Structure 1
């Protein structure tokens, strides 16, 4: 077994004192530990995220690895070889880079907390790592984790 990578430890914090509704979600508490009860409408394909990325320079074949992609696919700017002056045209290393599972499940609030004459508000929930394919659509279910904000890619 020659291939040995760093283990991607995932930390799960459950049993919060309170649970939030989708209607109760405000933007003042992003990056905070929240628990949300809801019903999944549809689930997405278990797809690979580019978690840790490695790239090669096309000029001098220098290697830059551990590039982190937050929300868009990014390439390194400065070539680490001081003799080379490359700025663009970086080739991705598919084998060397480390990937993670991704799933985007879309949830809405339950029919018990839906008020009179309202369409249900929706929310996208990201499952990564071990938690992929755990939630099936149409189930009353509680997700505990992080409220995040995503930009227009």
Structure 2
């Protein structure tokens, strides 16, 4: 932070910030009488990107189905927005206490109203309390690039050579279909269809604005005796950006959007 005094144009700068919005206590000018009358210089001061994200205990890690415990994680700078709602993530960073900044005294804010700690001169009669939060310096998830260059130029040269040895093969088309749903026997036509669904058509926009669908819609009619759901389990396990749902369990709203 950086501040210019009200009664003289002198500037305080590189003012470190506590959890409360922190302003200078003394004027650097030995002539000046000021304390605590300031204007923040927005241009000289430096901000950082900041984002709180709330996380809850993993569903498969709760011991006996009781409530999951929660925590507040602060992301900053380049690490913001790498999380997403419903994502399963691993963070690393600092476990920190965050005070009740209202209780600590704050410009323009009346204080808030567990037993805290008191006697600290900033508090006078008030008693300060703390939440835990996690100041995360790093994030990863643990749970369409449709141009050749932006895809290829991310690959390892080993992967490039595997791609070349695949396209070299004149009859790779059969090898692809036999690689679909390898745990289910037979039914070559269905496997061919699923291959030609993960490989979609080319979506088009006409001069009049009218769109043409690129996606391919497939139906697999089968008796409940048939190994039918294996195809859905396979493709939802395999294909990126996909979901499984049951016909009667899901309503019209639940299917499109509610």
How do residues 11-30 of structure 1 correspond to structure 2 at under 5 angstroms? none
Pairing 1:115–2:59 present: no
What does residue 96 of structure 1 align with? 44
Distance 2:17 2:93 in 1: 20
What does residue 31 of structure 2 align with? 83
Structure 1's unaligned 5+ residue stretches are 1-52
How do residues 31-42 of structure 1 correspond to structure 2 at under 5 angstroms? none
Pairing 1:73–2:21 present: yes
Structure 2's unaligned 5+ residue stretches are 102-258
TM-score (norm 2): 0.38
Distance 2:45 2:96 in 1: 25
More strand by share: 1
What does residue 7 of structure 2 align with? 59
**RMSD of Structure 2 on Structure 1 (CA):** 0.8
Equivalent position SS for 1:147 = strand
Equivalent position SS for 1:80 = coil
Larger Rg: 2
TM-score (norm 1): 0.64
Pairing 1:151–2:99 present: yes
More helix by share: 2
What does residue 129 of structure 1 align with? 77
Distance 2:63 2:3 in 1: 52
List, as ranges, runs of 4+ consecutive aligned residues in structure 1 with deviation greater than 2 Å. none
Distance 2:18 2:8 in 1: 27
User: Which string of whole-angstrom CA distances, capped at 9 and with x for unpartnered residues, describes residues 21-52 of structure 1?
Assistant: xxxxxxxxxxxxxxxxxxxxxxxxxxxxxxxx
